[PDB]
Amino acid sequence: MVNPTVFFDIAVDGEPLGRVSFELFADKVPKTAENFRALSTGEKGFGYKGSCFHRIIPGFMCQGGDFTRHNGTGGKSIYGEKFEDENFILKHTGPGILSMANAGPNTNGSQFFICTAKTEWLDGKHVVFGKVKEGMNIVEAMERFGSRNGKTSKKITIADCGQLE
Ligand SMILES: Cc1cccnc1N
Ligand SMILES: Cc1cccnc1N
């Protein structure tokens, strides 16, 4: 009934940086929320722990969740390789929005992005399913290791992750 909360403990070239928590909008996009939740606990036998934010563009977004290819070409959902666009009820309203990366209609896997600006042109194209709850300062710290083309100057990893409460 209460939207679940997940955390990522972030590291920068293996050094602890801090924790980012997310609210997942299970109330609005249950299927998409449950995928991310489960990938964050690792309870299906695979998931985000030890993966990296392979593409970070300051003033746009931090993208991750490619635990099979490590570069934006991989990843898989708890439902199969890909799953449908659940709905587009929620919009890309500003920094902190958590949304699904994809490669076309109905191609959600595990890759996601955290917005660091309003990205309204993505509305109706990417499924928004959560928001940063605590540690937007850590996201901003992460964002500083990105670049215009998205290549990071240090390796930004999810050293640990899971579900809070
Ligand atoms: C999007 C999707 C869902 C289930 C099976 N195949 C697919 N491509
Ligand atoms: C396979 C893939 C590539 C880029 C974004 N999402 C995906 N599921």
- How many CB atoms are closer than 10 A to CB 103? 11
Which residues does a 6 A CB cutoff place in the pocket of ligand 2? 72-73, 75, 82, 101-103, 107, 109, 111
**Nearest residue CA, atom 2 of ligand 1?**
83
DSSP string for residues in the chain: -PPPEEEEEEEETTEEEEEEEEEE-TTT-HHHHHHHHHHHHTTTS--STT-B--EEETTTEEEE--TTTSSSS---BBTBS-B------S---STTEEEE--SSTT-B-S-EEEESS--GGGTTTS-EEEEE-S-HHHHHHHHTT--TTS--SS-EEEEEEEEE-
Which ligand is closest in space to the CA of residue 76? 2
Say which of 55, 90, 98, 145 is annotated catalytic: 55
Resolution in A: 1.8
- How many residues belong to the chain? 165
79 CA from centroid of ligand 1 (Å):
9
Say which of 53, 67, 83, 113 is annotated catalytic: 113
Say which of 102, 108, 111, 129 is annotated catalytic: 102
Q: For the chain, how many structural domains are there in total?
A: 1
Task: Give the integer Cα–Cα distance in Å for 68 and 76.
Answer: 8
Its sign, for the CA torsion 8, 121, 60, 109, is positive
* Rounded (5°) CA angle 29-136-118: 60
Task: Give the integer Cα–Cα distance in Å for 23 and 6.
Answer: 7
Task: Give the integer Cα–Cα distance in Å for 157 and 112.
Answer: 14
Which residue range forms the structural domain that includes residue 53?
1-165
Is 63 marked active-site? yes
Phi-psi region of 4 (alpha: psi -120 to 50; beta: other; left: phi over 0): beta
Task: Give the integer Cα–Cα distance in Å for 118 and 109.
Answer: 23
Residue with tokens 């309003």, as numbered in its chain: 118
Which residues does a 6 A CB cutoff place in the pocket of ligand 1? 80, 82-84, 106
Which ligand is closest in space to the CA of residue 71? 2
Is 102 marked active-site? yes
Cβ 147 vs Cβ 111: under 8 Å: no
**At 63, which CATH number?**
2.40.100.10
Based on its alpha-carbon atoms, the radius of gyration of the chain, rounded to whole angstroms, reads: 14
